Design a protein. Structure first.
Lengths: 209, 203
């Protein structure tokens, strides 16, 4: 297969976990859906300013903060809609902005600050203004074993990496406005030292944990 | 900023840019946080423009719409009580898209939204295009980029709907006035300030 350079399925999850542990990002690739999608993925707790800038530069710029229901409930974040008519049930909450520490909310530093506040150990609802320029997604309980989404993969990988169970993701896009396909995702992975792992890889891997 | 003209010549030139299927840089030079946004008339925006806008902006590409339009589409406000910016619930085209995130797809969503006989069922929620409700009265009521985009579309003879995105640098900092000017000059997208536009409308 196209991913051999990153290792076997096991080795791929293992190396993704290791990248995260060492403050790098990973490319999570969907192999299994009608539209394949490669996402830039970081552990929220670990993410750096330069990584947020990289993410905005090369992704959709709709940078999502993937969170547990527990976390979502702690922040009193209701779902953006009560009736979700999105094609793949994409789990957006109401959007958020740090109540302190930001200006407009849009800069890489700003988005980071709101992510940091959201995931902070004793984070309170009042810590967040709504709406804003950071887009929380509610992970399905059970992670990739319940829903093979990049949202769930980012949370499962953060946790596998021994971080707080919170991901940051953004879809890799090309400068012409097309979304990256598997070859372009691999090219990007190789050039930015962010290994590729498929949601299948991860799913398989946890089924046996 | 005199490279672009006088205050009146700046609004006249922005309007013309839009008329001819180009973008404009709308600059806030009166708030504490100065901000330059890429601005297009919705009805006129092309694919290459949507790509440019994702590439160099925040990527949070907003569709600025009248209250009329928002109620035609049965778009409630995202929040019932705003602690923040007038975000509506977010939208995807119900037909004609896949994931919604490509430049082609965002455009297809925008086109469905502003189309003459658009109905709520035309849009799935949530999605990856972010409508913003303009305040009644435009810039004369609220000197925001959201209002400016709608007032410029209208001045330019389009449906009263803008697309906007905040210009960002590759290092994740937001563009300031020098950078907004450089980008404008490089992409043939004229700079106009919200003050410029407000004055021009007052008359």
């Amino acid at each position: 297969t196209l991913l051999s350079d990153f290792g076997t399925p096991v080795e791929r999850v293992e190396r993704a976990i290791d990248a995260l542990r060492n403050g790098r990002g990973v490319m999570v690739l969907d192999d299994e859906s009608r539209e394949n999608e490669g996402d830039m993925v970081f552990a929220a707790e670990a993410m750096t300013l330069e990584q947020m800038a990289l993410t905005i530069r090369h992704g959709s710029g709709i940078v999502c903060l993937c969170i547990t229901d527990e976390r979502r409930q702690q922040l009193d974040l209701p779902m953006m809609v009560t009736h979700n008519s999105s094609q793949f049930q994409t789990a957006f909450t109401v959007t958020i902005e740090a109540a302190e520490g930001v200006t407009t909310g849009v800069s890489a530093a700003d988005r980071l600050t709101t992510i940091r506040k959201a995931i902070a150990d004793n984070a309170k609802p009042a810590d967040l203004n709504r709406p804003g320029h950071v887009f929380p997604l509610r992970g399905q309980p059970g992670g990739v074993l319940s829903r093979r989404g990049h949202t769930e993969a980012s949370i499962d990988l953060a946790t596998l990496a021994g971080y707080k169970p919170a991901g940051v993701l953004c879809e890799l896009t090309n400068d012409d406005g097309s979304m990256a396909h598997a070859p372009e995702v691999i090219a990007f992975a190789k050039l930015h030292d962010m290994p590729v792992v498929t949601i299948d890889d991860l799913a398989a891997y946890l089924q046996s944990r």
